[PDB]
Short mmCIF file of C-alpha atoms and ligand atoms in Angstrom, two decimals:
data_model
loop_
_atom_site.label_atom_id
_atom_site.label_comp_id
_atom_site.label_asym_id
_atom_site.label_seq_id
_atom_site.Cartn_x
_atom_site.Cartn_y
_atom_site.Cartn_z
CA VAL A 1 -46.91 12.93 3.83
CA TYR A 2 -49.79 10.46 3.42
CA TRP A 3 -50.44 10.85 -0.34
CA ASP A 4 -48.67 11.83 -3.56
CA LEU A 5 -51.04 13.92 -5.69
CA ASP A 6 -48.28 14.74 -8.20
CA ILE A 7 -48.31 11.28 -9.82
CA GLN A 8 -50.13 11.45 -13.15
CA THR A 9 -52.57 8.78 -14.31
CA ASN A 10 -51.65 6.06 -16.74
CA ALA A 11 -55.25 4.78 -16.91
CA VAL A 12 -56.69 4.97 -20.44
CA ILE A 13 -60.47 4.85 -21.04
CA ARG A 14 -62.94 5.52 -23.81
CA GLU A 15 -64.33 9.05 -23.56
CA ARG A 16 -67.61 9.09 -21.61
CA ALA A 17 -70.66 11.29 -21.78
CA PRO A 18 -71.19 13.35 -18.60
CA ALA A 19 -73.15 11.51 -15.92
CA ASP A 20 -76.77 12.23 -15.01
CA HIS A 21 -76.40 12.39 -11.21
CA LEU A 22 -78.26 15.23 -9.56
CA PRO A 23 -75.60 17.73 -8.39
CA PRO A 24 -75.10 17.66 -4.62
CA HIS A 25 -76.38 20.35 -2.24
CA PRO A 26 -76.13 20.36 1.57
CA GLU A 27 -79.92 20.69 1.93
CA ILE A 28 -80.37 17.32 0.20
CA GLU A 29 -77.39 15.74 1.94
CA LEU A 30 -78.81 16.70 5.34
CA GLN A 31 -82.16 15.13 4.47
CA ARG A 32 -80.46 11.94 3.25
CA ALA A 33 -78.47 11.87 6.52
CA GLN A 34 -81.59 12.27 8.63
CA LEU A 35 -83.50 9.57 6.73
CA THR A 36 -80.56 7.15 6.84
CA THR A 37 -80.43 7.59 10.61
CA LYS A 38 -84.14 6.72 10.72
CA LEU A 39 -83.48 3.70 8.49
CA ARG A 40 -80.80 2.41 10.87
CA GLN A 41 -83.36 2.89 13.66
CA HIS A 42 -85.97 0.81 11.79
CA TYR A 43 -83.34 -1.90 11.34
CA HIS A 44 -82.59 -1.84 15.08
CA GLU A 45 -86.30 -2.14 15.93
CA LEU A 46 -86.88 -4.97 13.44
CA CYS A 47 -83.97 -7.02 14.77
CA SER A 48 -85.14 -6.46 18.34
CA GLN A 49 -88.85 -7.12 17.82
CA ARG A 50 -88.55 -10.08 15.43
CA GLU A 51 -85.46 -11.85 16.81
CA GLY A 52 -84.56 -10.25 20.16
CA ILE A 53 -81.07 -9.29 18.99
CA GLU A 54 -79.10 -6.17 18.23
CA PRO A 55 -78.33 -5.58 14.55
CA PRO A 56 -75.16 -7.56 13.78
CA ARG A 57 -72.22 -5.19 13.94
CA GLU A 58 -71.35 -3.51 10.60
CA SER A 59 -74.16 -5.45 8.86
CA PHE A 60 -76.08 -2.34 7.77
CA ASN A 61 -72.94 -0.89 6.16
CA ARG A 62 -72.13 -4.17 4.42
CA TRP A 63 -75.76 -4.27 3.24
CA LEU A 64 -75.32 -0.85 1.59
CA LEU A 65 -72.32 -2.23 -0.31
CA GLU A 66 -74.00 -5.47 -1.38
CA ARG A 67 -77.14 -3.66 -2.50
CA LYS A 68 -75.16 -1.25 -4.64
CA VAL A 69 -73.75 -4.17 -6.65
CA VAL A 70 -77.24 -4.78 -8.08
CA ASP A 71 -79.11 -1.51 -7.44
CA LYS A 72 -80.61 0.15 -10.52
CA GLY A 73 -82.22 2.98 -8.54
CA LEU A 74 -81.72 6.72 -8.32
CA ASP A 75 -79.97 7.36 -5.00
CA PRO A 76 -76.16 7.48 -4.71
CA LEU A 77 -76.23 5.92 -1.21
CA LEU A 78 -79.48 4.06 -0.47
CA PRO A 79 -80.91 1.11 -2.44
CA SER A 80 -84.28 1.25 -4.17
CA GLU A 81 -84.39 -1.10 -7.17
CA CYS A 82 -82.65 -4.41 -6.43
CA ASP A 83 -83.14 -7.97 -7.68
CA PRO A 84 -83.17 -9.99 -5.43
CA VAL A 85 -85.18 -8.05 -2.87
CA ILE A 86 -83.67 -10.09 -0.01
CA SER A 87 -80.00 -9.24 0.55
CA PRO A 88 -77.94 -12.43 0.95
CA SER A 89 -75.44 -10.37 2.94
CA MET A 90 -77.87 -9.10 5.57
CA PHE A 91 -79.61 -12.48 5.72
CA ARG A 92 -76.34 -14.32 6.35
CA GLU A 93 -75.21 -11.86 9.05
CA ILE A 94 -78.50 -11.86 10.99
CA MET A 95 -78.72 -15.65 10.94
CA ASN A 96 -75.24 -15.96 12.45
CA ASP A 97 -76.51 -14.07 15.54
CA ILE A 98 -79.55 -16.33 16.06
CA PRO A 99 -80.56 -17.16 18.68
CA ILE A 100 -77.82 -14.94 20.20
CA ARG A 101 -74.67 -13.13 19.17
CA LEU A 102 -71.52 -14.98 20.24
CA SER A 103 -69.27 -12.57 22.13
CA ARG A 104 -65.55 -12.67 22.90
CA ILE A 105 -64.50 -14.86 25.83
CA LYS A 106 -61.51 -14.24 28.10
CA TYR A 107 -62.43 -16.04 31.33
CA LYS A 108 -63.80 -19.47 32.20
CA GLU A 109 -66.86 -17.88 33.79
CA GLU A 110 -67.63 -15.90 30.64
CA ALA A 111 -67.52 -19.10 28.58
CA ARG A 112 -69.89 -20.89 30.96
CA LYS A 113 -72.31 -17.95 30.87
CA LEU A 114 -72.28 -17.79 27.07
CA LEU A 115 -73.02 -21.52 26.80
CA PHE A 116 -75.94 -21.20 29.22
CA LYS A 117 -77.19 -18.07 27.41
CA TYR A 118 -77.17 -19.94 24.10
CA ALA A 119 -78.99 -22.96 25.53
CA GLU A 120 -81.59 -20.80 27.27
CA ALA A 121 -82.26 -18.72 24.13
CA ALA A 122 -82.62 -21.81 21.93
CA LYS A 123 -85.17 -23.20 24.41
CA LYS A 124 -87.22 -19.98 24.47
CA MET A 125 -87.21 -20.07 20.67
CA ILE A 126 -88.66 -23.60 20.55
CA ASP A 127 -91.10 -22.85 23.38
CA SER A 128 -92.57 -19.74 21.77
CA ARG A 129 -92.36 -20.12 17.97
CA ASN A 130 -93.61 -22.40 15.20
CA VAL A 131 -91.27 -25.37 14.74
CA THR A 132 -91.56 -28.82 13.22
CA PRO A 133 -91.79 -31.78 15.61
CA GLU A 134 -88.46 -33.17 14.38
CA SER A 135 -86.61 -29.89 14.94
CA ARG A 136 -88.31 -29.36 18.30
CA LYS A 137 -87.19 -32.69 19.73
CA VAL A 138 -83.59 -32.30 18.51
CA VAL A 139 -83.16 -28.84 20.04
CA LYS A 140 -84.98 -29.85 23.22
CA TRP A 141 -82.70 -32.86 23.64
CA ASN A 142 -79.51 -30.85 23.10
CA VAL A 143 -80.60 -28.04 25.43
CA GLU A 144 -81.60 -30.55 28.13
CA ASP A 145 -78.29 -32.40 27.71
CA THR A 146 -76.32 -29.17 28.12
CA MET A 147 -78.31 -28.19 31.22
CA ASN A 148 -77.70 -31.65 32.70
CA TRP A 149 -73.97 -31.30 31.98
CA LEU A 150 -73.86 -27.85 33.62
CA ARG A 151 -75.64 -29.44 36.60
CA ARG A 152 -72.65 -31.71 37.33
CA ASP A 153 -70.59 -31.13 40.48
CA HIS A 154 -67.00 -31.02 39.21
CA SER A 155 -66.55 -28.12 36.80
CA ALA A 156 -64.80 -28.16 33.42
CA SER A 157 -62.24 -25.77 31.93
CA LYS A 158 -62.76 -22.64 29.85
CA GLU A 159 -61.86 -24.51 26.66
CA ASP A 160 -64.32 -27.28 27.54
CA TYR A 161 -67.11 -24.70 27.90
CA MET A 162 -66.13 -23.21 24.53
CA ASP A 163 -66.00 -26.66 22.88
CA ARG A 164 -69.39 -27.50 24.39
CA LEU A 165 -70.83 -24.32 22.87
CA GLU A 166 -69.32 -25.01 19.44
CA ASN A 167 -70.82 -28.51 19.48
CA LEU A 168 -74.19 -27.29 20.77
CA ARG A 169 -74.35 -24.62 18.07
CA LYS A 170 -73.36 -27.19 15.43
CA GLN A 171 -76.28 -29.44 16.40
CA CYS A 172 -78.91 -26.75 17.00
CA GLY A 173 -77.83 -24.36 14.25
CA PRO A 174 -79.73 -25.76 11.24
CA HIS A 175 -82.89 -26.25 13.30
CA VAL A 176 -82.81 -22.75 14.76
CA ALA A 177 -82.10 -21.44 11.25
CA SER A 178 -85.19 -23.17 9.87
CA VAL A 179 -87.32 -21.63 12.64
CA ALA A 180 -86.11 -18.07 11.99
CA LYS A 181 -85.57 -18.16 8.20
CA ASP A 182 -88.84 -16.56 7.06
CA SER A 183 -88.74 -13.96 9.85
CA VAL A 184 -85.18 -12.96 8.91
CA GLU A 185 -86.04 -12.70 5.21
CA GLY A 186 -88.85 -10.37 6.28
CA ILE A 187 -86.39 -8.02 8.00
CA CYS A 188 -84.25 -7.91 4.84
CA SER A 189 -87.25 -7.13 2.62
CA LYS A 190 -88.83 -4.56 4.91
CA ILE A 191 -85.66 -2.52 5.37
CA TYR A 192 -85.15 -2.53 1.57
CA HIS A 193 -88.72 -1.35 1.00
CA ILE A 194 -88.41 1.42 3.60
CA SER A 195 -85.18 2.47 1.90
CA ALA A 196 -86.99 2.71 -1.43
CA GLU A 197 -89.61 5.00 0.09
CA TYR A 198 -86.93 7.26 1.56
CA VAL A 199 -85.14 7.32 -1.82
CA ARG A 200 -88.33 8.54 -3.49
CA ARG A 201 -88.66 11.32 -0.89
CA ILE A 202 -85.05 12.48 -1.35
CA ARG A 203 -85.36 12.34 -5.15
CA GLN A 204 -88.49 14.51 -5.17
CA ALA A 205 -86.89 17.00 -2.77
CA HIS A 206 -83.77 17.22 -4.95
CA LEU A 207 -85.83 17.67 -8.12
CA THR A 208 -87.87 20.43 -6.45
CA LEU A 209 -84.70 22.23 -5.33
CA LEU A 210 -83.23 22.25 -8.85
CA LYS A 211 -86.55 23.52 -10.24
CA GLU A 212 -86.48 26.27 -7.59
CA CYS A 213 -83.06 27.19 -9.03
CA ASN A 214 -84.48 27.18 -12.60
CA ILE A 215 -82.08 24.34 -13.50
CA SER A 216 -83.26 21.92 -16.18
CA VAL A 217 -82.87 18.18 -15.57
CA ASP A 218 -83.55 17.20 -19.20
CA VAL A 219 -67.09 9.71 -27.97
CA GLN A 220 -67.18 5.94 -27.50
CA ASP A 221 -64.25 5.16 -29.83
CA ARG A 222 -61.78 7.85 -28.70
CA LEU A 223 -59.32 6.66 -26.03
CA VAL A 224 -58.15 9.30 -23.52
CA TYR A 225 -56.36 9.40 -20.21
CA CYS A 226 -58.90 9.05 -17.41
CA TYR A 227 -60.50 12.11 -15.82
CA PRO A 228 -62.98 12.84 -13.01
CA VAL A 229 -66.67 12.08 -13.44
CA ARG A 230 -68.47 15.18 -14.77
CA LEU A 231 -72.14 16.01 -14.23
CA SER A 232 -74.31 17.03 -17.16
CA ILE A 233 -76.79 18.94 -14.96
CA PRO A 234 -75.56 22.42 -13.93
CA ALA A 235 -74.80 22.69 -10.25
CA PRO A 236 -77.09 24.80 -8.04
CA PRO A 237 -75.74 27.95 -6.35
CA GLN A 238 -73.49 27.72 -3.32
CA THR A 239 -75.22 27.81 0.04
CA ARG A 240 -73.96 29.39 3.27
CA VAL A 241 -71.38 27.06 4.83
CA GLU A 242 -69.15 28.51 7.56
CA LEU A 243 -65.57 27.37 8.16
CA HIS A 244 -63.35 27.85 11.19
CA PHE A 245 -60.47 25.84 12.62
CA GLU A 246 -60.22 24.57 16.20
CA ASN A 247 -57.07 22.73 17.33
CA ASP A 248 -56.16 21.68 13.78
CA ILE A 249 -59.73 20.46 13.10
CA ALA A 250 -61.66 22.06 10.25
CA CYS A 251 -65.23 22.72 11.40
CA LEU A 252 -67.85 23.32 8.69
CA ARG A 253 -71.33 24.43 9.73
CA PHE A 254 -74.41 24.30 7.49
CA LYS A 255 -77.63 25.67 9.04
CA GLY A 256 -76.40 24.79 12.51
CA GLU A 257 -75.29 21.29 11.46
CA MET A 258 -71.56 20.77 12.02
CA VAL A 259 -69.15 18.37 10.34
CA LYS A 260 -65.45 18.08 11.15
CA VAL A 261 -62.36 16.94 9.26
CA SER A 262 -58.67 17.24 10.14
CA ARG A 263 -56.74 20.25 8.86
CA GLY A 264 -54.44 17.97 6.89
CA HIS A 265 -57.34 16.26 5.13
CA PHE A 266 -58.97 19.63 4.48
CA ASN A 267 -55.82 20.93 2.77
CA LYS A 268 -55.75 17.67 0.79
CA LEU A 269 -59.34 18.22 -0.37
CA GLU A 270 -58.48 21.76 -1.45
CA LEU A 271 -55.68 20.37 -3.63
CA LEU A 272 -57.82 17.54 -5.05
CA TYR A 273 -60.49 20.12 -5.91
CA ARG A 274 -57.96 22.30 -7.74
CA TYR A 275 -56.84 19.26 -9.73
CA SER A 276 -60.31 17.87 -10.38
CA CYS A 277 -63.08 20.51 -10.41
CA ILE A 278 -63.73 22.55 -13.56
CA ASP A 279 -66.96 24.40 -12.71
CA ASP A 280 -65.88 26.55 -9.76
CA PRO A 281 -62.93 28.82 -10.64
CA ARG A 282 -63.43 31.11 -7.62
CA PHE A 283 -64.09 28.28 -5.12
CA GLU A 284 -67.56 29.68 -4.39
CA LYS A 285 -69.03 26.13 -4.22
CA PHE A 286 -66.05 24.52 -2.47
CA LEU A 287 -67.26 24.67 1.15
CA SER A 288 -70.77 23.54 0.15
CA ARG A 289 -69.21 20.52 -1.52
CA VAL A 290 -66.76 19.70 1.27
CA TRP A 291 -69.67 19.77 3.72
CA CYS A 292 -71.61 17.33 1.50
CA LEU A 293 -68.57 15.07 1.10
CA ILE A 294 -67.79 14.76 4.82
CA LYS A 295 -71.47 14.33 5.70
CA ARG A 296 -71.97 11.62 3.04
CA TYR A 297 -69.05 9.57 4.35
CA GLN A 298 -70.14 10.10 7.98
CA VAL A 299 -73.57 8.75 7.01
CA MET A 300 -72.09 5.81 5.08
CA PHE A 301 -70.11 4.76 8.16
CA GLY A 302 -72.73 5.56 10.80
CA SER A 303 -70.53 7.90 12.87
CA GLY A 304 -64.47 -3.25 10.53
CA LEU A 305 -65.38 -2.99 6.86
CA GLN A 306 -62.14 -1.98 5.11
CA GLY A 307 -58.41 -1.54 5.56
CA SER A 308 -55.77 0.85 4.27
CA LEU A 309 -52.19 0.45 2.96
CA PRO A 310 -49.06 2.12 4.36
CA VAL A 311 -47.55 4.97 2.37
CA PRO A 312 -44.22 3.17 1.66
CA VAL A 313 -46.24 0.35 0.08
CA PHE A 314 -47.95 2.75 -2.35
CA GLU A 315 -44.54 4.27 -3.09
CA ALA A 316 -43.22 0.79 -3.89
CA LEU A 317 -46.27 -0.08 -6.01
CA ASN A 318 -45.72 3.08 -8.07
CA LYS A 319 -41.94 2.75 -8.35
CA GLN A 320 -41.76 -1.02 -8.95
CA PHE A 321 -45.00 -1.67 -10.86
CA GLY A 322 -46.01 1.74 -12.26
CA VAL A 323 -49.25 1.88 -10.28
CA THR A 324 -51.00 5.25 -10.59
CA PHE A 325 -54.60 4.50 -9.63
CA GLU A 326 -56.69 3.06 -6.78
CA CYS A 327 -59.69 0.92 -7.80
CA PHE A 328 -61.30 1.37 -4.35
CA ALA A 329 -60.81 4.63 -2.47
CA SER A 330 -62.41 7.86 -1.24
CA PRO A 331 -61.22 11.47 -1.52
CA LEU A 332 -60.31 11.21 2.15
CA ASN A 333 -58.19 8.03 1.95
CA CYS A 334 -56.78 8.06 -1.61
CA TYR A 335 -53.00 8.07 -2.19
CA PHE A 336 -53.21 9.10 -5.86
CA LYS A 337 -55.31 11.93 -7.26
CA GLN A 338 -57.03 9.46 -9.61
CA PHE A 339 -59.16 6.68 -8.10
CA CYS A 340 -62.59 5.07 -8.20
CA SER A 341 -65.02 5.63 -5.33
CA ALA A 342 -68.57 4.88 -4.26
CA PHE A 343 -70.14 8.34 -4.75
CA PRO A 344 -69.54 9.93 -8.17
CA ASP A 345 -72.12 12.69 -7.55
CA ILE A 346 -69.92 14.30 -4.89
CA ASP A 347 -66.52 12.55 -5.16
CA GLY A 348 -65.91 13.58 -8.80
CA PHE A 349 -65.16 17.13 -7.69
CA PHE A 350 -62.26 15.65 -5.70
CA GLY A 351 -60.88 13.27 -8.34
CA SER A 352 -63.18 10.24 -8.40
CA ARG A 353 -63.61 8.37 -11.67
CA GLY A 354 -66.84 6.86 -10.29
CA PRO A 355 -67.61 3.38 -8.96
CA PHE A 356 -65.17 0.68 -10.00
CA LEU A 357 -67.68 -1.64 -11.69
CA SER A 358 -68.58 1.26 -14.03
CA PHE A 359 -64.93 2.05 -14.83
CA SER A 360 -63.52 0.39 -17.97
CA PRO A 361 -59.82 1.05 -18.60
CA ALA A 362 -58.10 -0.25 -21.71
CA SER A 363 -54.65 0.11 -20.12
CA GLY A 364 -52.93 1.22 -16.94
CA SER A 365 -51.40 -0.11 -13.74
CA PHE A 366 -53.81 -0.36 -10.81
CA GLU A 367 -54.02 -1.21 -7.12
CA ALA A 368 -57.20 -2.66 -5.60
CA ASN A 369 -57.98 -2.89 -1.87
CA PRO A 370 -61.75 -3.51 -1.81
CA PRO A 371 -64.04 -3.18 1.19
CA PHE A 372 -64.96 -6.46 2.86
CA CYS A 373 -68.15 -7.22 0.92
CA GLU A 374 -68.16 -10.69 -0.63
CA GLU A 375 -70.65 -9.73 -3.34
CA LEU A 376 -68.70 -6.64 -4.39
CA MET A 377 -65.46 -8.63 -4.43
CA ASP A 378 -67.04 -11.27 -6.67
CA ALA A 379 -68.25 -8.65 -9.15
CA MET A 380 -64.79 -7.07 -8.97
CA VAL A 381 -63.13 -10.31 -10.09
CA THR A 382 -65.55 -10.74 -12.99
CA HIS A 383 -64.83 -7.12 -13.96
CA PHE A 384 -61.06 -7.66 -13.79
CA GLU A 385 -61.15 -10.61 -16.19
CA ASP A 386 -63.59 -8.86 -18.53
CA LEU A 387 -61.21 -5.90 -18.84
CA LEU A 388 -58.06 -8.01 -19.08
CA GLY A 389 -59.59 -10.05 -21.91
CA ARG A 390 -61.00 -7.07 -23.81
CA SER A 391 -57.66 -5.29 -24.22
CA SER A 392 -54.23 -6.15 -25.60
CA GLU A 393 -52.73 -2.95 -24.15
CA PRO A 394 -50.68 -3.12 -20.93
CA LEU A 395 -53.15 -3.73 -18.11
CA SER A 396 -52.27 -4.78 -14.55
CA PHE A 397 -54.19 -5.09 -11.27
CA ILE A 398 -52.45 -5.71 -7.93
CA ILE A 399 -55.10 -6.81 -5.45
CA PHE A 400 -55.02 -6.92 -1.64
CA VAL A 401 -57.65 -9.01 0.19
CA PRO A 402 -57.87 -10.79 3.55
CA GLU A 403 -56.36 -14.29 3.58
CA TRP A 404 -59.55 -15.99 4.76
CA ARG A 405 -59.87 -19.75 4.24
CA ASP A 406 -62.68 -20.78 6.63
CA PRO A 407 -64.22 -20.74 4.08
CA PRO A 408 -62.41 -18.76 1.38
CA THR A 409 -64.55 -16.16 -0.32
CA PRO A 410 -65.62 -17.08 -3.87
CA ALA A 411 -63.70 -14.03 -5.10
CA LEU A 412 -60.39 -15.23 -3.64
CA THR A 413 -60.89 -18.71 -5.10
CA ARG A 414 -61.66 -17.28 -8.54
CA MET A 415 -58.64 -14.95 -8.49
CA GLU A 416 -56.33 -17.85 -7.61
CA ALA A 417 -57.72 -19.80 -10.59
CA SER A 418 -57.63 -16.88 -13.03
CA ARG A 419 -55.85 -17.32 -16.35
CA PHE A 420 -54.32 -13.87 -15.72
CA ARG A 421 -52.67 -14.63 -12.36
CA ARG A 422 -48.96 -13.85 -12.65
CA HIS A 423 -47.93 -14.01 -8.97
CA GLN A 424 -49.36 -14.37 -5.48
CA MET A 425 -47.92 -13.86 -2.00
CA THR A 426 -48.82 -13.06 1.61
CA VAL A 427 -48.08 -9.77 3.38
CA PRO A 428 -49.01 -8.65 6.93
CA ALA A 429 -52.73 -8.31 7.59
CA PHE A 430 -54.67 -5.05 7.54
CA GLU A 431 -53.97 -2.92 10.61
CA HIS A 432 -55.15 0.48 11.82
CA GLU A 433 -53.44 3.26 9.86
CA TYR A 434 -53.18 6.53 11.79
CA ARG A 435 -53.95 8.79 8.80
CA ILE A 436 -56.59 -11.91 11.04
CA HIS A 437 -54.20 -14.32 9.32
CA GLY A 438 -52.71 -12.07 6.65
CA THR A 439 -53.27 -10.26 3.37
CA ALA A 440 -53.26 -12.08 0.05
CA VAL A 441 -51.58 -10.07 -2.73
CA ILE A 442 -52.60 -11.20 -6.22
CA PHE A 443 -51.14 -9.94 -9.52
CA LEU A 444 -53.60 -10.13 -12.43
CA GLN A 445 -52.09 -9.00 -15.74
CA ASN A 446 -52.71 -9.56 -19.42
CA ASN A 447 -49.80 -10.47 -21.70
CA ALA A 448 -48.82 -6.86 -22.38
CA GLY A 449 -49.19 -5.95 -18.71
CA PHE A 450 -47.00 -8.90 -17.74
CA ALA A 451 -44.34 -7.80 -20.23
CA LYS A 452 -44.27 -4.19 -19.03
CA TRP A 453 -44.72 -4.65 -15.27
CA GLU A 454 -43.45 -8.18 -14.66
CA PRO A 455 -43.38 -9.26 -10.98
CA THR A 456 -39.70 -10.17 -11.01
CA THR A 457 -37.84 -11.29 -7.89
CA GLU A 458 -36.24 -7.87 -7.33
CA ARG A 459 -39.51 -5.96 -7.75
CA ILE A 460 -41.32 -8.34 -5.40
CA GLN A 461 -38.45 -7.94 -2.93
CA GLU A 462 -38.69 -4.15 -2.93
CA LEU A 463 -42.46 -4.32 -2.42
CA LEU A 464 -41.97 -6.66 0.55
CA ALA A 465 -39.30 -4.30 1.91
CA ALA A 466 -41.93 -1.53 2.09
CA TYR A 467 -43.39 -3.36 5.11
CA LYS A 468 -40.04 -3.82 6.92
N1 SAH B 501 -68.15 0.60 -5.85
C1 SAH B 501 -67.01 1.12 -5.37
N2 SAH B 501 -66.02 1.50 -6.24
C2 SAH B 501 -64.83 2.05 -5.78
N3 SAH B 501 -64.60 2.20 -4.42
C3 SAH B 501 -65.58 1.80 -3.56
C4 SAH B 501 -66.79 1.27 -4.00
N4 SAH B 501 -67.55 0.98 -2.90
C5 SAH B 501 -66.85 1.32 -1.79
N5 SAH B 501 -65.63 1.84 -2.20
C6 SAH B 501 -64.51 2.35 -1.39
O1 SAH B 501 -63.44 1.42 -1.33
C7 SAH B 501 -62.57 1.85 -0.29
C8 SAH B 501 -61.89 0.66 0.39
S1 SAH B 501 -60.71 1.15 1.66
C9 SAH B 501 -59.29 1.41 0.54
C10 SAH B 501 -58.32 2.45 1.08
C11 SAH B 501 -57.16 2.92 0.21
N6 SAH B 501 -57.65 3.70 -0.93
C12 SAH B 501 -56.31 1.75 -0.29
O2 SAH B 501 -56.33 1.43 -1.48
O3 SAH B 501 -55.55 1.13 0.48
C13 SAH B 501 -63.42 2.72 0.65
O4 SAH B 501 -62.94 4.06 0.62
C14 SAH B 501 -64.83 2.59 0.08
O5 SAH B 501 -65.72 3.67 0.29
#
């Protein structure tokens, strides 16, 4: 019992024309998977060759999210037409691991080794790369001072080694950053430009497949309850995808390539497809599409970027505040059968209303638990206030984000200063759901939304009780 697909939407939108996404097919999904693996490999080689580091953990996935905020290109997953070319997300994450990645410390000896490793790497940087005379002498002095300190007889504590590293990094940081800046920007640009080449290859392959199938690739005022994204281009024929179950795991094989999903999630997808798909009355295309869906999300992940909410919390959001819709979800993790998601081309068959920034409700009660991408969260806040100010119909958004204050994300600061904020509180932080400080819960509502779904004391109390 991890979802409630019986709850009907109360989201109201203007009727939309069907979307122009090329309809998914496992042949194309497999190629996109193989090229995205190669792209991650290029990123690994660039980080190693240019800066001697591993790719910062989760940075490639966060890059995909940031790029999609601005991407105007043709692929549902990979970026190809972005201004600016250099991702501020990837740049920021690589620079934080220069000249080395700081790892977790448990023991005094691990702290001493990390401090030495930092000092040694900063020295090799200054010895082997172009650096201004001012920056060179400052780093050289700090490295030499640290090595002299480590040379002393009587040893210090673990906390003293950690404090020495924090101070050393504070002094060297800006100088090391100035040495590596142009190199790091070059990694960000190159991986974007390789992505664009791969996107062109996938696009041509997908166009050629639809032509092989003899498939042609060539109202705003009416308000309706929301409905899944529909594709204007007819879908290609089903392909051969084989299903069998092993130990409650659904195994789907396309041309020898296997993907797996739990039996419970599989049965969920079958139900979402019954509720959401209108072009496949005999389920002939169902296994082809489930294979594409699982593969797409496996590729997106690559096998610390998002968190989920416990079922009793969604029950309380629906019962106390009328929530029927998730602004950020996937067919695999949604609680409601109506939600926005990253991949309209494949997720629409399973209930997706498309990406959130392209979704424009006039009314409804919503929950939002975005992935941890600062750029996406900032666009989300702008989108919230645009929608809340465009409509006088009841409109509410209940938003869950990490309570981070060192420094706070621009999104969290803007939401706390919003003219639509009706309430704010702290609930326990995101934890692993089986299916650091805390979680900020922010209520953004227009006048009509505040009248209909007011966060009264009793309603807030029942929502808090859903954690107890
Ligand atoms: N542009 C976008 N629009 C809507 N959802 C998006 C998105 N980009 C990423 N996502 C999705 O946002 C989700 C955040 S995890 C949220 C889990 C769960 N639905 C909950 O509300 O608690 C992920 O499934 C992620 O793929």
